[PDB]
Design an enzyme around this catalytic site. Structure first.
Site, PDB file in Angstrom:
ATOM      1  CG  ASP A 136       0.031  -4.647   6.897  1.00  0.00           C
ATOM      2  OD1 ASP A 136      -1.065  -4.716   6.294  1.00  0.00           O
ATOM      3  OD2 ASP A 136       0.218  -5.166   8.024  1.00  0.00           O
ATOM      4  CG  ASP A 190       2.819  -3.381  -2.139  1.00  0.00           C
ATOM      5  OD1 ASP A 190       2.314  -2.527  -1.376  1.00  0.00           O
ATOM      6  OD2 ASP A 190       3.002  -4.563  -1.784  1.00  0.00           O
TER       7      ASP A 190
END
Ligand SMILES: *[C@@H]1O[C@H](CO)[C@@H](O[C@@H]2O[C@H](CO)[C@@H](O[C@@H]3O[C@H](CO)[C@@H](O)[C@H](O[C@H]4O[C@H](CO)[C@@H](O)[C@H](O)[C@@H]4O)[C@@H]3O)[C@H](O)[C@H]2NC(C)=O)[C@H](O)[C@H]1NC(C)=O
Ligand SMILES: *[C@@H]1O[C@H](CO)[C@@H](O[C@@H]2O[C@H](CO)[C@@H](O[C@@H]3O[C@H](CO)[C@@H](O)[C@H](O[C@H]4O[C@H](CO)[C@@H](O)[C@H](O)[C@@H]4O)[C@@H]3O)[C@H](O)[C@H]2NC(C)=O)[C@H](O)[C@H]1NC(C)=O
Ligand SMILES: *[C@@H]1O[C@H](CO)[C@@H](O[C@@H]2O[C@H](CO)[C@@H](O)[C@H](O)[C@H]2NC(C)=O)[C@H](O)[C@H]1NC(C)=O
Ligand SMILES: *[C@@H]1O[C@H](CO)[C@@H](O)[C@H](O)[C@H]1NC(C)=O
Ligand SMILES: *[C@@H]1O[C@H](CO)[C@@H](O)[C@H](O)[C@H]1NC(C)=O
Ligand SMILES: *[C@@H]1O[C@H](CO)[C@@H](O)[C@H](O)[C@H]1NC(C)=O
Lengths: 395, 396
Positions: free
Chosen positions: B200, B139
């Site tokens: 997201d 990430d």
């Protein structure tokens, strides 16, 4: 409006959201706006128990009328789609023990472009009373100034009154004054049974949230003006259609009960899931919506993507709705002090709490200083009913 | 990434969207991020036929690690929530015939605030390979500059390669790169098995639409760079949760097949409706997603709140999705000329058309000059499969 009608919010069925302005009976005979469509719905409103749950107004929205007025100034039911005309349709509806609603517009044209009622209010009012119409939805499209809007809505109100027939009068009035003209709700209440406050609903969660937040934000202005004979109208129930998840459907049903909203379904009653039928026909929730005290609820607090709404009920009872606004994750735990509910009278010295949604469940006694825990789904709502133990013991 | 992995889009299960960063095992033992959670999911992935349908990666997202690195600077599995550690968990997953995915971050901290991998790439890569990890989601949170972002992602890529273990490498690289400049996708595919294009996702139609529209808008940059060993990642499947209507769920499943997307479910496999199970396990749709030719589809056209997406499949077959973007009314009729589909090759001289979603249904044969009519639900999708009749007569 002081006409003895809508002493509790009006319930029924309105075609618009689900069927719209579909004029193609050739390619789409099953979903075009026709007399056949409304007859099918009327049959089903009885046979599927919709009437028994309380839904008794079968309402025609826009696109029922022919393109022109007749040689006597009257609106005409479209020759192909309503060959037997409105009167026979009204008769059919009355024989099933239901009532019939029709649609017109205060301006030069309806929103869909068909003949408006400007300069025909008296004629159009008489025509409706003659047919046996029981409810008129009066829309605010194609009105050139706010002055004409006001006069038009006022005129039709009195024009209907003069006919001597009981007609539930529904006004888009205040919706067409947003946001730079504060509507006078004292005035609107004098002339209307209910009134549309905001933008047209559609089959989406975005729309529901938009409506809820507008209501809550402007609550100080609109809540207290509502009561028997005059209601705020946050628009049609879209439960049982296409755009809402099950949790979002529950949220609409719950909150519409809280807001003392009219309950106009807009769906296909021929093709509706058993769950949806059950939720829309829920006895206990409808009872909350239809509470005889007729006091609209409000948002008590918000924060951390939770919302708490409550509504005072007759017999010193209270409905309480808790909305999980977080659109990520799973069932999120939420805890409130029962002392915060109902201005701190609801559970003093105690209250019995029944959950009504998402499922019915008796949760028991909660005393004045106790806390209540729940788990609410993302975009879902928990709806509760609170009986005070002092009141309970009194016979 | 040329590591012989993800020759068709990776499939599995990832905890994030559904369970998030829940650390309260005291009050919420059943949905806190624990070793017990992942073992339950592993058991079910087998017993409920997820492995058979193709889902074989059980993936841990954020919030698995302890707040601090141990004295040797290693990431530690949280002592309470993962007392038996990652290595045992990995073993358990392997014994079920599944593979294990883990999560780390290129910056100083993970998105949830736990230790990041900056200045520990080598150490962390080695720790994973030792444990038996099979997939790393990497990430892009808490990275101070774009050069560091690039180097970090490049470094871990090689750091993993040096360990000698096969590890599916998933990069949030381009997603975190977008709010500054245009990413180099040639470069990204060199170092990554798949790559996240978005911040997201969540349990909402709003999110799905947002993802679809950005992808179609930017399809010129991104579609053609995808292929075996390197995929565009539009994020987790949220089917079977709370925020999508049945029609919207169908739309997600269909379009994720079109986009040759990885299929990482994020849901509670202990509590999932038969319908959701059936859709997520749909043999024919999964086959479209997993088509060995490995060409990502694209939006063919848009207008009047309709969208047509298509994907080329091996054997001169085609998948076609038609989305009704109008969020008011009922099933809206839509009509297209079959000559427009598959660059005009699909149905010349004809094609046989099978509908896969919302239900399976053989439609029939269609000449190059014929029109197809469908009715599509508001926010729904119709998914079709086209076999060319030249390829059918070649049954010998
Ligand atoms: C046209 O407009 C006129 C002018 O306002 C309107 O007349 C009003 O009608 C209402 C409703 O019928 C009258 O209110 C009633 O008054 C009587 C006598 O005081 C009451 O007994 C009635 O009580 C009812 O409501 C109770 C609940 O609140 C019930 O428990 C009970 O069962 C009764 O139903 C009711 O309050 C009102 O007096 C007149 N107003 C005037 C100034 O004349 C008329 O109805 C309109 N006509 C049409 C066809 O719309
Ligand atoms: C670390 O990085 C190195 C260097 O990039 C990487 O080495 C590469 O591995 C791949 C996969 O093992 C090799 O690619 C294969 O090479 C063989 C022999 O030349 C070919 O037969 C293969 O062609 C096809 O056939 C296979 C079907 O059975 C398929 O697997 C494949 O997709 C093809 O369709 C295939 O090209 C490649 O040779 C090396 N590259 C170099 C330059 O060495 C290594 O795997 C990485 N290590 C780890 C542990 O990840
Ligand atoms: C909004 O309209 C209402 C109803 O017309 C107003 O109340 C009236 O006010 C007039 C003065 O212009 C009086 O003659 C009436 O006696 C009032 N009637 C009632 C029932 O109250 C109200 O004042 C207006 N409010 C605002 C803010 O303009
Ligand atoms: C409708 O049309 C007439 C003629 O154009 C115009 O004068 C009138 O004011 C209009 N009425 C309204 C309410 O818009
Ligand atoms: C991590 O923190 C240090 C000290 O503030 C800083 O120099 C370094 O660049 C940071 N790393 C990243 C990738 O943000
Ligand atoms: C991206 O950069 C690489 C070098 O890192 C180079 O080989 C390639 O030409 C560039 N691609 C594009 C599309 O600019």
């Amino acid at each position: 409006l002081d006409n003895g009608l809508a002493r509790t919010p009006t319930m029924g069925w309105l075609h618009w959201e689900r069927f719209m302005c579909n004029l193609d009976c050739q390619e789409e005979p099953d979903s075009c706006i026709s007399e056949k469509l409304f007859m099918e719905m009327a049959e089903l409103m009885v046979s599927e128990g919709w009437k028994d749950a309380g839904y008794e107004y079968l309402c025609i929205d826009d696109c029922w009328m022919a393109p022109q007025r007749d040689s006597e100034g009257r609106l005409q039911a479209d020759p192909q789609r309503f060959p037997h005309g409105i009167r026979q349709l009204a008769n059919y509806v009355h024989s099933k023990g239901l009532k019939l609603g029709i649609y017109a517009d205060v301006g030069n044209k309806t929103c869909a472009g068909f003949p408006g009622s400007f300069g025909y209010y008296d004629i159009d009012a008489q025509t409706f009373a003659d047919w046996g119409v029981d409810l008129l939805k009066f829309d605010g499209c194609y009105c050139d100034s706010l002055e004409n809007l006001a006069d038009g809505y006022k005129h039709m109100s009195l024009a209907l009154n003069r006919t001597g027939r009981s007609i539930v009068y529904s006004c888009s009035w205040p919706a067409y004054m947003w946001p730079f003209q504060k509507p006078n709700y004292t005035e609107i209440r004098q002339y209307c049974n209910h009134w549309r406050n905001f933008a047209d609903i559609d089959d989406s969660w975005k729309s529901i949230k938009s409506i809820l937040d507008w209501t809550s934000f402007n609550q100080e202005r609109i809540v207290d003006v509502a009561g028997p004979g005059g209601w705020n109208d946050p628009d049609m129930l879209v439960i049982g259609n296409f755009g809402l998840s099950w949790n979002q459907q529950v949220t609409q049903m719950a909150l519409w009960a809280i807001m003392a909203a009219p309950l106009f379904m807009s769906n296909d009653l021929r093709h509706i899931s058993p769950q949806a039928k059950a939720l829309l026909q829920d006895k206990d929730v409808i009872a909350i919506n239809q509470d005889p005290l007729g006091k609209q609820g409000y948002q008590l607090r918000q924060g951390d993507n939770f919302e708490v709404w409550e509504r005072p009920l007759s017999g010193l009872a209270w409905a309480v709705a808790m909305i999980n606004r977080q659109e990520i994750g799973g069932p999120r735990s939420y805890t409130i002090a029962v002392a915060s509910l109902g201005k701190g009278v609801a559970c003093n010295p105690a209250c019995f709490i029944t959950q009504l949604l998402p499922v019915k469940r008796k949760l028991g006694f909660y005393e004045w200083t106790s806390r209540l825990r729940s788990h609410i789904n993302p975009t879902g709502t928990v709806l509760l009913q609170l009986e005070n133990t002092m009141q309970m013991s009194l016979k």
